Structure formats: C-alpha cells, structure tokens
C-alpha cells in the first residue's frame, strides 16, 4: 500500500540521517569509503563481505533495508570486519578496533534514543508480510 511505502520512506530518511552523522565524525573516516586494493591487496581475500558507510548509503537508496535490524546487521559487519582484519596488539590495530567498536556503539545509541520501538515493529510486520 501507499501507507506502507510512506513507512519505508520514513525508515530510509531516518537511516540516511543516522549514517550521515556517523560519516561526518572524524573518528570514523576510515569507515566512509571501501578499502583501496592498491593499499590492501589481501583485504578482498580475507574479508568476504566488505562494508563501509558509502556502501550503506547506496543500499538505503536501493531500498535494501526494510527494518532497522537489517541496517544494524551492516553496521555490525563494519565492526566485525575490523576486529577480524586488525586483531594484533600493535597500536595501529588497537586504534582501528576501538574506532570500529565506537562506530557500532554510537549507531546503537542513536537508534536506542531516537527510533520509536513501534515504528521498528511496524516495519518488521510489513517486511514479514512480503
């Protein structure tokens, strides 16, 4: 229905604003663009499902997220990819892990404070109806 399309549009506007807020944070700059294979030719080898905030915007705009849970799965990938690719005790790896945990925690904290639980529940029910 048109009302269901309006609901999904509101979801995309919300997710684009959350993603923009993460992308303008200087801590998260490394997560804004895909990994350049020139710099890291082993990246695409080790990390099966690369994810970054530019890819998330592209997915919102392709109507790939029908619930906030589906969006948080891609935020969780950004975090888990960084924990897996940079697991060493050296400061460069620890800094990337801490920034990735902080992205993830920030996204969840914005959604806890600003997502209406009944809005998420409605999206879930439309999705499950398709």
Ligand X SMILES: OCCn1cc(Br)cn1
- Max CA distance (Å), the chain: 53
Residue whose CB is less far from ligand X, 89 or 130: 89
List residues binding ligand X (CB under 6 A): 76, 79-80, 94, 97-98, 101, 104
Q: Are 80 and 47 in contact (CB under 8 A)?
A: no
Q: Are 71 and 115 in contact (CB under 8 A)?
A: no
Residue whose CB is less far from ligand X, 61 or 84: 84
**Shortest distance, CB of residue 80 to ligand X, whole angstroms?**
4
Residue whose CB is less far from ligand X, 59 or 104: 104
Q: Which residues contact 75 (CB under 8 A, 6 or more apart)?
A: 56, 103, 104, 107, 108
**Shortest distance, CB of residue 55 to ligand X, whole angstroms?**
16
């Amino acid at each position: 229905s048109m009302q269901e399309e309006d609901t999904f549009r509101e979801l995309r506007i919300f997710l684009r604003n959350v993603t923009h807020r993460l992308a303008i944070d200087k801590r998260f700059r490394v997560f804004t663009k895909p990994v350049d294979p020139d710099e890291v030719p082993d990246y695409v080898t080790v990390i099966k499902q690369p994810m970054d905030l530019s890819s998330v915007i592209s997915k919102i705009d392709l109507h790939k997220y029908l619930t906030v849970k589906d969006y948080l799965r891609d935020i969780d990938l950004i975090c888990s990819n960084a924990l897996e690719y940079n697991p060493d005790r050296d400061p460069g790896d620890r800094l990337i892990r801490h920034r990735a945990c902080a992205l993830r925690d920030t996204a969840y904290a914005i959604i806890k404070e600003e997502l209406d639980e009944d809005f998420e529940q409605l999206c879930e029910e439309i999705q499950e109806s398709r």
